[PDB]
Amino acid sequence: TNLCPFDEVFNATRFASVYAWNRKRISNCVADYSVLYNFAPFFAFKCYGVSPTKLNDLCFTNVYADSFVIRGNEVSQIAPGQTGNIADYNYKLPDDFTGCVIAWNSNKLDSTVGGNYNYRYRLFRKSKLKPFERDISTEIYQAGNKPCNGVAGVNCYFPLQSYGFRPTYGVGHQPYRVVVLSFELLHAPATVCGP
Amino acid sequence: STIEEQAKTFLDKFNHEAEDLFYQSSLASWNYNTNITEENVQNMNNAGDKWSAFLKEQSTLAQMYPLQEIQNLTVKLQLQALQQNGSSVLSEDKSKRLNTILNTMSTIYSTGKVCNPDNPQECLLLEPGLNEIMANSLDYNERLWAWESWRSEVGKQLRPLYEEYVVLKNEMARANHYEDYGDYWRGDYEVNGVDGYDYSRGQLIEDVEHTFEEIKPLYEHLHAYVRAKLMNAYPSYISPIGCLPAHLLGDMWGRFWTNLYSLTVPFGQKPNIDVTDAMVDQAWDAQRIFKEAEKFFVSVGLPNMTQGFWENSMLTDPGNVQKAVCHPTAWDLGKGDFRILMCTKVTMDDFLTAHHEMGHIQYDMAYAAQPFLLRNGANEGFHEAVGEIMSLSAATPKHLKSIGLLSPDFQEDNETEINFLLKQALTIVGTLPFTYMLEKWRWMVFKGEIPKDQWMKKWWEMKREIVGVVEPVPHDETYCDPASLFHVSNDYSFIRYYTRTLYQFQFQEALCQAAKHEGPLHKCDISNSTEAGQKLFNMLRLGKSEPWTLALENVVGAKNMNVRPLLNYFEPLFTWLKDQNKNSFVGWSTDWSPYA
Ligand SMILES: *[C@@H]1O[C@H](CO[C@@H]2O[C@@H](C)[C@@H](O)[C@@H](O)[C@@H]2O)[C@@H](O[C@@H]2O[C@H](CO)[C@@H](O)[C@H](O)[C@H]2NC(C)=O)[C@H](O)[C@H]1NC(C)=O
Ligand SMILES: *[C@@H]1O[C@H](CO)[C@@H](O[C@@H]2O[C@H](CO)[C@@H](O)[C@H](O)[C@H]2NC(C)=O)[C@H](O)[C@H]1NC(C)=O
Ligand SMILES: *[C@@H]1O[C@H](CO)[C@@H](O)[C@H](O)[C@H]1NC(C)=O
Ligand SMILES: *[C@@H]1O[C@H](CO)[C@@H](O)[C@H](O)[C@H]1NC(C)=O
Ligand SMILES: *[C@@H]1O[C@H](CO)[C@@H](O)[C@H](O)[C@H]1NC(C)=O
Numbered sequence: 001t002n003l004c005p006f007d008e009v010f011n012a013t014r015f016a017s018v019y020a021w022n023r024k025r026i027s028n029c030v031a032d033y034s035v036l037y038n039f040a041p042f043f044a045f046k047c048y049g050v051s052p053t054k055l056n057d058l059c060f061t062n063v064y065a066d067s068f069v070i071r072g073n074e075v076s077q078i079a080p081g082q083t084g085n086i087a088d089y090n091y092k093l094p095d096d097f098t099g100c101v102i103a104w105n106s107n108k109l110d111s112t113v114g115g116n117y118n119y120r121y122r123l124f125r126k127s128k129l130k131p132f133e134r135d136i137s138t139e140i141y142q143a144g145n146k147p148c149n150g151v152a153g154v155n156c157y158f159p160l161q162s163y164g165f166r167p168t169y170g171v172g173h174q175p176y177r178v179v180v181l182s183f184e185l186l187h188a189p190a191t192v193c194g195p
Numbered sequence: 196s197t198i199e200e201q202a203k204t205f206l207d208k209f210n211h212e213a214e215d216l217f218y219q220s221s222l223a224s225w226n227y228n229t230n231i232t233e234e235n236v237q238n239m240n241n242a243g244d245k246w247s248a249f250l251k252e253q254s255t256l257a258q259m260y261p262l263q264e265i266q267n268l269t270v271k272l273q274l275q276a277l278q279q280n281g282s283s284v285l286s287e288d289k290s291k292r293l294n295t296i297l298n299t300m301s302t303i304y305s306t307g308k309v310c311n312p313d314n315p316q317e318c319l320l321l322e323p324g325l326n327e328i329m330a331n332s333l334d335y336n337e338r339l340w341a342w343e344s345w346r347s348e349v350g351k352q353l354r355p356l357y358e359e360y361v362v363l364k365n366e367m368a369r370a371n372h373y374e375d376y377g378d379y380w381r382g383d384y385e386v387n388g389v390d391g392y393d394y395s396r397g398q399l400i401e402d403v404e405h406t407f408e409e410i411k412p413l414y415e416h417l418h419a420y421v422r423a424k425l426m427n428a429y430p431s432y433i434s435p436i437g438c439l440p441a442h443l444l445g446d447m448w449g450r451f452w453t454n455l456y457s458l459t460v461p462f463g464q465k466p467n468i469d470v471t472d473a474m475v476d477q478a479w480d481a482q483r484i485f486k487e488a489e490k491f492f493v494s495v496g497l498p499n500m501t502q503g504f505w506e507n508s509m510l511t512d513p514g515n516v517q518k519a520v521c522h523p524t525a526w527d528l529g530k531g532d533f534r535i536l537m538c539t540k541v542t543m544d545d546f547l548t549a550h551h552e553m554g555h556i557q558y559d560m561a562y563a564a565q566p567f568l569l570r571n572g573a574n575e576g577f578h579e580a581v582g583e584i585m586s587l588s589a590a591t592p593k594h595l596k597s598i599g600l601l602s603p604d605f606q607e608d609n610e611t612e613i614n615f616l617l618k619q620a621l622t623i624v625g626t627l628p629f630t631y632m633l634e635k636w637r638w639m640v641f642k643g644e645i646p647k648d649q650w651m652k653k654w655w656e657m658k659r660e661i662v663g664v665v666e667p668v669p670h671d672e673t674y675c676d677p678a679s680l681f682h683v684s685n686d687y688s689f690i691r692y693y694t695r696t697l698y699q700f701q702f703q704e705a706l707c708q709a710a711k712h713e714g715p716l717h718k719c720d721i722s723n724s725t726e727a728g729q730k731l732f733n734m735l736r737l738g739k740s741e742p743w744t745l746a747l748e749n750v751v752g753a754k755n756m757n758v759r760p761l762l763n764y765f766e767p768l769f770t771w772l773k774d775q776n777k778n779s780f781v782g783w784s785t786d787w788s789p790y791a
């Protein structure tokens with residue numbers, strides 16, 4: 001039996017930044033949610049829509065998992081109908097989102113003494129972001145009424161900023177890896193479900 | 196895109212950069228305060244240089260947003276904090292001269308050397324030496340020698356520097372669109388824009404005189420009691436109707452009267468409460484001290500201390516292997532990092548200092564959600580008031596009985612009451628006139644009401660007329676007596692102590708009324724009172740986001756500084772002093788001088 005491998009993204013070596021978030025699709029396999037219970041300490045385990053107990057005996061079309069890591073006081077914005085810098089410019093969840101979000105502390109792995117500036121998010125953006133949309137653009141953000149032509153300062157800023165994680169931070173400024181599970185049911189016959 | 200969205204984005208960028216830079220600087224400073232080595236000093240130097248360069252650069256870019264076009268009263272305060280020019284308004288030559296003068300004066304004060312006129316091979320410094328002499332000696336001539344020497348060899352070299360300091364600081368103040376440097380200092384208490392909560396810079400003066408006029412009678416009675424009890428130690432050096440000599444106050448400058456308790460104790464037979472032995476015999480250590488303080492803070496509704504507090508804080512002296520600066524400090528490194536640096540010992544004094552510093556940490560934790568430029572006290576006299584009140588609450592006999600440090604069958608009399616009250620008054624009530632005198636003299640000097648050739652004359656007239664102390668030897672215009680204090684040689688303000696002393700008792704009275712306490716205010720324990728904790732927390736979370744008028748009103752229900760709560764605290768002592776002074780004279784005469 002070809003079990004759905006819900007253990008390769010949960011246990012990866014290095015994750016991606018918030019603004020550049022990767023997508024892994026799961027199809028043509030049987031899904032076993034028992035192995036998902038591993039790593040017992042969970043910071044936040046909430047499901048919107050379906051129920052975790054009844055998720056086993058349900059057949060869908062495709063399952064999408066997205067991986068990113070943020071700070072502690074921003075996990076609240078991975079909920080629908082929530083407003084914030086991460087919730088507006090980096091990741092959006094629809095009002096009718098179905099699935100669960102899993103978050104846990106990752107202080108030991110993702111923090112380095114002297115700073116870890118390899119993980120970046122976005123702070124300035126001309127407009128908001130539609131649900132399930134990415135933006136890897138790196139053009140200079142204009143905050144004034146004069147053209148910038150591409151340069152830092154004067155009235156121009158670089159849109160993306162670096163977290164700079166350190167192991168001595170507080171519980172809200174410590175890294176927290178987050179994975180989101182989304183479920184879709186199309187007119188195609190359902191195949192993705194376990195015994 | 197109006198100026199609002201331009202200022203907001205600039206503030207966002209500044210907020211995200213200042214946090215990292217200040218965290219690096221704070222970590223380097225903490226590493227130096229734990230380990231003393233050349234590498235750590237260099238790390239501090241680099242971090243501070245980066246922080247200062249970034250701060251100047253941002254302050255230079257912050258002048259392109261005029262204040263008149265911005266209306267939110269939240270982003271206006273951040274830009275007001277950022278746009279302070281300071282020394283940049285002067286030329287390079289004047290700025291470097293000012294820095295040279297300041298460093299020279301600080302160096303002269305730090306290495307001040309006085310030597311007795313018999314043998315130059317052995318002579319004393321300020322700390323230790325002269326401090327021990329005027330803190331633990333009952334001799335009249337030796338104290339006079341120290342008092343005159345420190346103002347003779349050291350005071351001479353500061354006056355020529357002080358005059359130029361005054362002139363250059365006045366030039367800078369007038370270049371910064373002020374009136375003088377005293378106006379610049381008073382600008383801390385200035386509030387504009389909010390209707391009904393305004394406060395002009397000249398209002399602070401009038402409030403200070405109005406409060407001091409009500410303070411005066413209690414100070415006069417305390418002065419009479421101290422004068423009566425100092426005539427037994429110096430039978431032929433004090434006049435019953437005159438002013439206390441300035442070199443017999445138990446301190447170098449007479450700032451505090453703490454060291455006169457051994458001479459002015461009301462009831463010598465009854466000792467004070469000291470639980471040092473009750474701590475030694477029950478296996479009390481530093482960890483248990485801080486756990487007890489945390490339990491006290493939790494009992495009133497305030498939260499726990501973080502898991503990183505217990506691991507990243509050094510609460511014990513490392514030993515001879517390491518070298519750490521033993522000075523109780525509360526550290527807010529930012530980004531959720533809170534630490535206390537203390538070489539804690541098993542003592543009641545350290546037991547209260549733990550509460551002081553943990554109240555500091557709690558106050559810092561309260562406003563952690565505010566923007567970077569608004570994370571501090573409402574004014575300069577709010578951050579120590581919380582530490583003092585939450586230290587006062589922990590020294591009550593009821594609280595020590597509750598935690599088992601005192602025997603349950605301990606019955607307190609009305610004599611230990613008076614002993615404790617007079618011990619408090621020697622250090623709380625005896626410092627307000629000194630602060631008033633010093634700040635008023637500095638304000639007059641900065642304004643120009645005192646000519647350059649009448650500085651010492653006005654200084655001693657004010658000392659005789661306000662404080663009630665008289666010089667033992669005459670001083671001409673070649674001396675600079677105010678410059679002998681630490682806060683004058685080093686550029687620092689001084690009215691914050693007066694403001695904090697008045698604020699803390701207002702806070703205590705408000706919280707005790709919220710705790711349904713019946714009896715004297717000095718017997719107040721705010722433990723096990725959730726209603727009292729919420730009332731304080733409603734003010735603690737504001738930071739500088741609101742004017743200090745509204746912050747004070749949140750707790751005390753009043754818009755202005757008041758002294759009646761302070762007087763209610765010392766009412767039993769006031770009645771006892773009035774009863775004891777029925778056969779003595781209250782007041783002093785300016786004419787009498789020791790050298791007349
Ligand atoms: C603060 O309260 C605690 C808990 O006491 C309980 O809550 C009070 C509000 C009140 O309702 C009490 O009747 C409750 O029992 C006190 O801790 C207890 O103190 C008593 C002293 O007589 C002692 O016998 C108990 O063993 C203590 N219980 C513990 C330590 O778990 C505490 O003393 C109070 N602090 C004060 C009054 O300053
Ligand atoms: C701080 O100093 C700067 C320059 O040192 C001031 O900026 C100038 O302000 C004057 C005021 O009329 C303007 O005419 C100039 O155009 C400004 N720029 C320069 C380069 O001179 C700034 O105003 C000062 N800050 C305050 C609060 O006065
Ligand atoms: C994650 O990978 C590590 C490294 O091989 C392994 O030791 C651990 O068991 C894995 N976790 C799970 C839940 O399989
Ligand atoms: C700090 O002091 C400890 C105590 O011995 C020592 O091991 C460590 O090397 C010191 N750190 C530095 C940077 O010298
Ligand atoms: C001031 O700016 C803050 C920044 O977000 C905003 O939330 C607030 O509403 C502004 N004040 C007013 C009165 O709109």
Ligand SMILES: *[C@@H]1O[C@H](CO)[C@@H](O)[C@H](O)[C@H]1NC(C)=O
Binds near residue numbers: 493498499
């Ligand atoms: C504070 O810590 C104590 C002991 O760890 C715990 O019993 C208490 O519930 C904590 N308080 C809060 C509000 O979490």
Ligand SMILES: *[C@@H]1O[C@H](CO)[C@@H](O)[C@H](O)[C@H]1NC(C)=O
Binds near residue numbers: 610
């Ligand atoms: C204390 O109480 C006693 C009780 O009779 C009283 O006589 C005395 O005057 C009070 N005051 C002092 C200072 O003892």
Ligand SMILES: [Zn+2]
Binds near residue numbers: 552
């Ligand atoms: Zn303090």
